[PDB]
Write a protein that binds this ligand. Structure first.
Ligand code: CLA
Ligand code: CLA
Ligand code: CLA
Ligand code: CLA
Ligand code: CLA
Ligand code: CLA
Ligand code: CLA
Ligand SMILES: CC1=C(C#C/C(C)=C/C=C/C(C)=C/C=C/C=C(C)/C=C/C=C(\C)C#CC2=C(C)C[C@@H](O)CC2(C)C)C(C)(C)C[C@H](O)C1
Ligand SMILES: CC1=CCCC(C)(C)[C@H]1/C=C/C(C)=C/C=C/C(C)=C/C=C/C=C(C)/C=C/C=C(C)/C=C/C1=C(C)CCCC1(C)C
Ligand SMILES: CC1=CCCC(C)(C)[C@H]1/C=C/C(C)=C/C=C/C(C)=C/C=C/C=C(C)/C=C/C=C(C)/C=C/C1=C(C)CCCC1(C)C
Ligand SMILES: CC1=CCCC(C)(C)[C@H]1/C=C/C(C)=C/C=C/C(C)=C/C=C/C=C(C)/C=C/C=C(C)/C=C/C1=C(C)CCCC1(C)C
Ligand code: SF4
Ligand code: SF4
Lengths: 33, 30, 80, 138, 151, 162
């Protein structure tokens, strides 16, 4: 696989960092007055 | 086969599409 | 808060007011029926929406009507 | 007015009582007078014994107070009960009976709220009142 | 001789005064916990709570993780505990952001500045306790085998 | 967002400039050590039987992350832990990452801040903008030629590193 480092870089990012920030910012948005 | 530069070009186009999608979402949100 | 309406088919039997657990309805003077009284809803901010008044109403299709709307602490029956 | 110094019925306590929203959002009070000391069922679960004379009780919801009022009305023939709303700021709002006369009895000065001058089958269809702030009643 | 009484001499509040809830031992233990102990800044409450919880967080990750049968089991367990600590710190941060309005008061836990201090203390204590647990298990063979080294 | 110092603010530009100066330093020092062979077992392939399935990269030979890449990533993990602790628990004197809602924004420096030499915020901002522009230029020179970034840095510095 050409650029085989990209799955190992992006899958942890997309699966843990993206949903964590999305849930945190959505929580902040929906709970703020 | 596909090279690293081609994947980088696709990533740049996807980032441009991300900026355009963010702009469309902001326009729809008024 | 829920919206409670009383239509002029009311016969003034006072059953809906007696069935109300939250003291939302009361009987006021009127000339449209033989009983001389009609139901009214001045206190719909305390209405939980239980529709016991609608169950109590004896007129063919109901004279008192509850329309569920925006939910508040009182209307949700929350003791917390 | 609500006399805060009215003694309470003798209760051993329960887990069903009022939560933090009673001291933070709003609380309800019910007073009544009994001719004798007698056991009643609490609307929150459990038995309490009310004293002879005046009784003051605190609840979280208006419906709990009115359920207790209905219970003492149909089981002890007590109709002099009064229900108030109390805020954390200390303002007391009298609730029931609002004009002193029970709502099932007609009293002068009451005005009709929410009365519609036609039958329910004469309400409008939504298509007249779409994109318009006209009510469905007419 | 009744052992169960109404809470705070209020029979109509939703609580009961019990030996489990309101005895002298329970009151002393609760009043001596860092979350309730008087004379503490929120930062030091955070430091003590974080030290305790971050110290005990190392153990399950080291002993039961997917790398537990490898030579880097303790390093992986400490790193996983640190990631859990960072996640919980983010939880504290968003809780403090959404729960409190910006006030001058900063000596109570339920204020914005006080909760930010508590979160900072909890992070620093959690890292310190996790590192201390890592040091102790790294340097004591008794902790590496959880007591089978005596047999 | 914008009321806390995030987005297009002078604080965020200053923070990214600081991180970009550190990035220029880290790339130069990485190039120096990688040319000089100071990475032990730089071509060693990490084994799944020791480090787990996270070491899998799925390339054509070895199917494991190299030890050198792991060392570079762990060196970055150290300063990420430092970053997290400084972001949540800063020093009392230190400049903070996120600012309070009622904060006073630093004035934009325009084309160029006043020429205050030394350990002044103006010099910090000037080299921070310079380092961000240099990172942009190094990335563009690396991807338009096929030269590796360490080799591009060594060529632009005239083979001083190695
Ligand atoms: C909707 C289309 C789609 C889907 C379902 C996937 C699915 C996947 N991609 Mg992929 N990808 C796509 C489009 C897509 N791709 C496009 C267009 C590109 C070119 C830029 C790539 C480039 C790409 C790379 C380089 C890598 C993946 C990888 C992966 C895998 C892990 C997820 C990840 O890290 O994402 C990462 C994906 C991106 C960073 C690109 C964003 C994807 C597109 C542009 C956005 C589409 C969003 C959608 C339309 C709207 C959703 C709204 C809502 C439901 C959230 C997964 C199988 C990884 C892999 O191989 O793991 C095995 C990996 O390394 N993708
Ligand atoms: C697509 C998303 C995704 C990804 C990429 C992973 C990835 C992983 N999981 Mg997993 N998991 C997921 C979804 C995901 N999981 C879900 C949805 C569940 C619920 C069913 C689980 C439940 C689960 C369990 C129960 C376990 C894993 C474990 C693991 C690790 C494999 C073992 C190993 O070698 O790590 C070794 C471990 C490490 C190197 C520690 C990594 C610590 C990270 C890098 C710290 C980062 C913290 C945080 C993200 C920082 C940002 C905060 C921000 C989001 C707010 C690996 C990192 C195992 C593990 O080892 O975890 C301890 C494990 O026990 N996962
Ligand atoms: C509840 C059911 C259950 C249990 C007990 C386990 C147990 C385990 N799983 Mg598993 N798992 C489960 C469900 C469960 N799994 C499910 C539903 C999924 C998704 C399908 C997974 C997916 C999964 C993956 C992918 C992996 C595991 C792994 C593990 C191991 C380590 C997990 C770890 O690091 O924990 C960390 C635990 C803690 C940080 C804390 C534990 C809780 C503490 C002990 C509670 C203490 C309470 C205390 C008594 C209160 C006292 C208060 C006061 C009085 C002082 C362990 C054997 C990993 C492994 O190696 O497999 C064997 C791994 O890689 N699990
Ligand atoms: C990939 C390299 C890289 C790295 C490590 C950083 C690092 C940083 N950037 Mg950044 N940035 C970069 C590239 C990078 N930048 C590029 C290419 C752009 C586009 C020009 C930006 C645009 C940008 C903005 C607009 C902001 C940052 C901010 C930040 C800081 C906080 C991280 C953040 O956004 O919240 C945490 C992010 C996640 C948890 C995900 C941190 C110092 C923020 C900052 O300094 O605020 C004070 C901020 O507002 N960056
Ligand atoms: C162009 C280089 C440069 C300059 C001029 C400054 C200048 C400054 N930084 Mg800074 N900084 C830099 C790079 C630089 N930094 C880098 C690369 C980082 C990331 C590691 C940081 C991280 C950083 C933080 C986290 C903080 C500062 C802060 C400050 C300010 C207070 C002084 C201080 O504590 O120094 C701190 C300096 C460093 C941490 C490293 C810089 C070391 C320099 C480059 C050494 C140069 C000495 C050299 C021989 C020239 C001597 C000149 C002679 C006249 C004395 C000051 C305006 C503080 C601030 O703004 O508070 C309000 C603060 O909290 N800096
Ligand atoms: C090799 C890359 C490089 C480049 C192109 C620059 C370029 C510049 N630096 Mg800088 N700097 C660098 C690395 C670099 N620096 C490093 C590694 C450090 C940490 C030791 C610093 C610390 C630093 C400080 C503390 C200051 C500058 C200043 C300046 C500006 C020069 C104006 C002046 O009076 O000079 C004076 C130059 C110095 C006192 C030291 C410069 C040392 C570098 C190696 C010379 C590079 C040319 C200029 C934009 C000054 C500035 O912007 O004034 C407003 C200033 O005060 N730089
Ligand atoms: C960090 C500071 C720094 C230092 C010490 C050097 C040092 C050097 N560069 Mg250089 N360079 C730099 C930054 C730097 N450069 C930058 C930022 C660029 C733009 C990307 C270049 C682009 C560049 C090219 C294109 C060439 C050099 C070359 C050279 C070497 C001989 C010519 C000379 O004296 O340079 C004079 C100074 C400059 C050219 C720029 C300052 C010398 C060792 C030459 C060489 O022999 O490299 C193989 C050459 O052809 N440099
Ligand atoms: C270099 C790289 C990184 C760095 C990153 C840094 C922060 C790179 C800087 C990205 C910065 C923010 C670039 C600024 C761009 C401004 C716009 C695009 C343009 C105007 C034309 C870090 C800090 C992770 C360290 C790493 O070891 C090396
Ligand atoms: C669902 C709904 C939500 C709201 C909006 C909506 C429109 C109504 C709709 C959204 C819809 C759809 C349209 C959303 C789908 C959206 C987009 C397409 C998501 C794509 C993301 C691409 C990632 C971030 C980037 C890779 C680029 C990185 C930064 C590059 C590196 C680069 C490479 C290596 C080469 C070197 C240079 C650099 C720059 C370094
Ligand atoms: C057992 C008993 C029987 C049954 C009943 C029971 C009551 C439930 C039970 C009790 C049970 C449970 C509740 C046991 C209670 C348990 C807890 C988990 C004990 C935690 C101890 C933490 C100590 C060691 C460390 C502080 C770290 C030191 C200071 C730091 C050094 C660090 C500092 C920052 C400075 C820098 C250096 C470094 C290394 C980074
Ligand atoms: C943190 C670390 C700890 C301790 C040690 C330490 C050393 C003190 C410190 C490291 C620190 C920091 C201070 C080190 C970081 C330092 C400095 C800021 C490095 C700046 C590099 C900028 C160069 C590459 C580029 C210029 C761009 C060129 C291509 C072009 C411009 C042209 C092109 C065609 C494009 C158009 C514009 C024009 C102008 C026409
Ligand atoms: S729905 Fe229930 S609370 Fe509302 S008016 Fe009818 S009986 Fe009373
Ligand atoms: S129950 Fe029906 S008919 Fe009787 S008073 Fe109420 S609205 Fe009128």
């Amino acid at each position: 696989m050409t650029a085989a480092y990209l799955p190992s870089i992006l899958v942890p990012i997309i699966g843990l960092i993206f949903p964590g920030l999305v849930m945190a910012f959505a929580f902040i948005y929906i709970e703020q007055d | 086969m596909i090279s690293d530069t081609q994947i980088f070009i696709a990533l740049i186009l996807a980032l441009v599409s991300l900026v355009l999608a963010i702009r469309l979402g902001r326009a729809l949100y008024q | 808060s829920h919206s409670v309406k009383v239509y002029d088919t009311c016969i003034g039997c006072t059953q809906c007011v007696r069935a109300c657990p939250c003291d939302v309805l009361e009987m006021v003077s009127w000339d449209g029926c033989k009983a001389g009284q009609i139901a009214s809803a001045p206190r719909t901010e305390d209405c939980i929406g239980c529709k016991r008044c609608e169950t109590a109403c004896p007129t063919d299709f109901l004279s008192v009507r509850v329309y569920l709307g925006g939910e508040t602490t009182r209307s949700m029956g929350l003791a917390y | 007015t609500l006399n805060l110094q009215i003694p309470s019925p003798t209760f051993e306590g329960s887990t069903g009582g009022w939560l933090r929203a009673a001291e933070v959002e709003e609380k309800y009070a019910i007073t009544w007078t009994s001719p004798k000391e007698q056991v009643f069922e609490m609307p929150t679960g459990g038995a309490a014994i009310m004293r002879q004379g005046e009784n003051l009780l605190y609840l979280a919801r208006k419906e709990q107070c009115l359920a207790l009022a209905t219970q003492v009305k149909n089981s002890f023939k007590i109709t002099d009960y009064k229900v108030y709303r109390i805020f954390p700021s200390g303002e007391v709002q009298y609730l029931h009976p609002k004009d002193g006369v029970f709502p099932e009895k007609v009293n002068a000065g009451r005005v009709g709220v929410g009365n519609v001058s036609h039958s329910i089958g004469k309400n409008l269809n939504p298509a007249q009142i779409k994109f318009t702030s006209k009510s469905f009643n007419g | 001789s009744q052992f169960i009484k109404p809470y705070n001499d209020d029979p109509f509040v939703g609580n009961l005064a019990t030996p489990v809830s309101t005895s002298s031992f329970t009151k002393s233990l609760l009043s001596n916990l860092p979350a309730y102990r008087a004379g503490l800044s929120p930062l030091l409450r955070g430091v003590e709570i974080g030290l305790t919880h971050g110290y005990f967080l190392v153990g399950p990750f080291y002993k039961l993780g997917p790398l537990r049968n490898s030579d880097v089991a303790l390093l992986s367990g400490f790193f996983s505990a640190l990631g859990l600590i960072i996640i919980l710190v983010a939880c504290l941060t968003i809780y403090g952001v959404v729960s409190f309005e910006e006030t001058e008061a900063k000596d109570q836990l339920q204020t914005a500045k006080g909760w930010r201090q508590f979160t900072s203390g909890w992070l620093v204590g959690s890292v310190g306790g996790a590192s201390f647990a890592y040091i102790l298990i790294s340097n004591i063979p008794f902790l590496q085998t959880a007591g089978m080294s005596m047999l | 967002f914008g009321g806390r110092g995030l987005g297009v603010t002078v604080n965020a530009e200053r923070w990214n400039g600081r991180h970009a100066m550190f990035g220029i330093f880290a790339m130069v020092m990485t190039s120096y050590m990688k040319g000089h062979g100071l990475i032990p077992d730089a071509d060693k392939i990490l084994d799944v039987a020791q480090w787990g399935s996270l070491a899998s990269v799925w390339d054509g030979a070895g199917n494991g992350i190299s030890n050198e890449r792991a060392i570079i990533l762990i060196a970055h993990v150290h300063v990420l832990v430092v970053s997290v602790i400084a972001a949540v628990a800063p020093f009392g004197f230190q400049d903070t990452l996120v600012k309070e809602k009622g904060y006073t924004p630093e004035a934009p420096a325009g084309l160029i801040p006043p020429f205050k030499t030394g350990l002044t915020p103006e010099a910090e901002l000037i080299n921070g903008r310079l380092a961000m522009l240099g990172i942009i230029s190094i990335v563009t020179a690396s991807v338009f030629t096929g030269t590796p970034v360490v080799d591009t840095i060594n060529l632009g510095m005239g083979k001083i590193l190695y």
